[PDB]
């Protein structure tokens, strides 16, 4: 009977190849009183989640420690249920914790991570986004994905309305069907804007796979008009963080897919119950991350796998050099493939913590 | 023109007189942040927010980080006067963390009503100067209970909070001994801080059915996301029934408006991200005909002396402010008289009052 003995945290920081419109992240780890370690990594992403490094690791330290320190690791769903009990939102934090606890799963039983949830498959293909500009720059950036062998591309719209409505223009001339658009307004418009960009897209021969988030995550009225009114599938990303917001929106039919996130869920426990609702409720759903570090990708990715998720905006993996993540996966792009034998997740802090 | 050219903060820490036990938690003691702006005319201004992290998730060094690098960039260099252009641009970069935001809002506010020479509660159109509240009663086996309100009764409160939603089976022998030990001058809230199911909900409030007693408000009975239960009870209810966990901002209160999911709302400055979102709150309430009540955090007396500036302001009477009565005198006598169960503020304070650097090194 193994029990947590240890916990340690560190933040990463990783380097963006270009500017997105670095990556702070806190890592945790894990020690049973057998020697093996655990690891999970999350994102600080303020702006989304509201969570801080300096937030998650005193929550971390302060909070959960005490409730699973000297806990049996066969105990996790109680412990964690615990913990998380004693925090509201700092969805992150609860995520590190969370993937922490499944490596830990994973390596007792001599098997990854993707093996431990259930996944046989190892490669999910993830678009490209594409970050907000004027027309011109956006295309030369979605014919660079293209040549880099994307055929999904996320375009990221809600800044500027007039230029995403004119951007479509752009689109139908200079692309085929073969290439799949999904739009992600980052809740940028209104019922109205939504609505126009909507019918501007039917104006034309597009391949169109997703409209993302058009409005305010509170606004569930409206998320239900558009998803009624639209041809296209509509996806709520802000809207659903957990399983209780996705019960709502499955309640009130406020989307047709739901984007989960584990930065959002904090974490695997929590995904897994949002994916059984939707499923019951015939709601799909694609998984999606925070521009984070690729161990979250990686995680992102075997949770995916698991659950025979195959719509995914894993991207992030782009922005950053391959040789962070080249140890547990290959890219060649679109395609995210898990290496083969890594026990756990397969990342390691070495360098982080030790080093 | 006056501008912010500083922005500073410090830890407060207070010990509690007595453990505060809820069913979401239990402590001895406060965890605050104080932040000060400087204006370039030298002029100074404070707010301070609790970290009550099982409620708003906020936590002192979450709130440090937000108050100094994400904020401070927004608002330093900036006019006064710009201060909702300043506030809204800010807090759009953070989701969460309510109670870094009211620390904030009550700074400025600290400085609009210290530049024109009055207080807090003036400037925002304070008539009375005083407010009554009840005493909260902390989870414990009934004799524990009847002990703390009895105290209670003996300080002079007549209003009295009883937290209830830990031990649901405690919830029900305890109505026994209420009915047995105090009059109907006695007036009883009650606030499960979501520890009921709605099953358990409604056989308690068939349950004081029962008896005789005076009972004001049943306050958060289930988990802030079941709004059909809240809802449902509301509906059920001869006791006005008010959200708390439900509602912290203005589109909160819509939806619980929407789905007639309470009688009363419990506003709150940590909750709320400080005054401006609540006189938003404040507003939609009036105009849906839903009641208010100002509450708190088991949180310093400086919050309780700006939530009370608030409902002076708002005309709202009902009041669970008493973290007074869990601490030293001396850390409120500064700015506020209590004759219990009386908040009372003190004459001819400029901006709040606090008094905070006297006691407190501020840092950047």
Redesign the interface.
Known sequence: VSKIIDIKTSIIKIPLKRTFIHIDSLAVELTLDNGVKGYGVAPAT?????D????M???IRE?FAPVILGSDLSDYKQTLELAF??????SAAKMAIDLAYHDLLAKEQDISVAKLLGAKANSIVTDVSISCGNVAETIQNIQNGVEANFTAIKVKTGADFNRDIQLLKALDNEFSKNIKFRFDANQGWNLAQTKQFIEEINKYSLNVEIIEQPVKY?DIKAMAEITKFSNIPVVADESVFDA?DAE?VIDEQACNMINIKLAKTGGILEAQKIKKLADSAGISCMVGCMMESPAGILATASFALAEDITVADLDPLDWVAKDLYSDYITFNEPNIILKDNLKGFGFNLAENLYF
């Open positions: 303020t702006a989304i989640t509201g801080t490094l300096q937030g690791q005193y929550i909070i009990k004693k925090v509201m939102f700092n509170y209780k709502r």
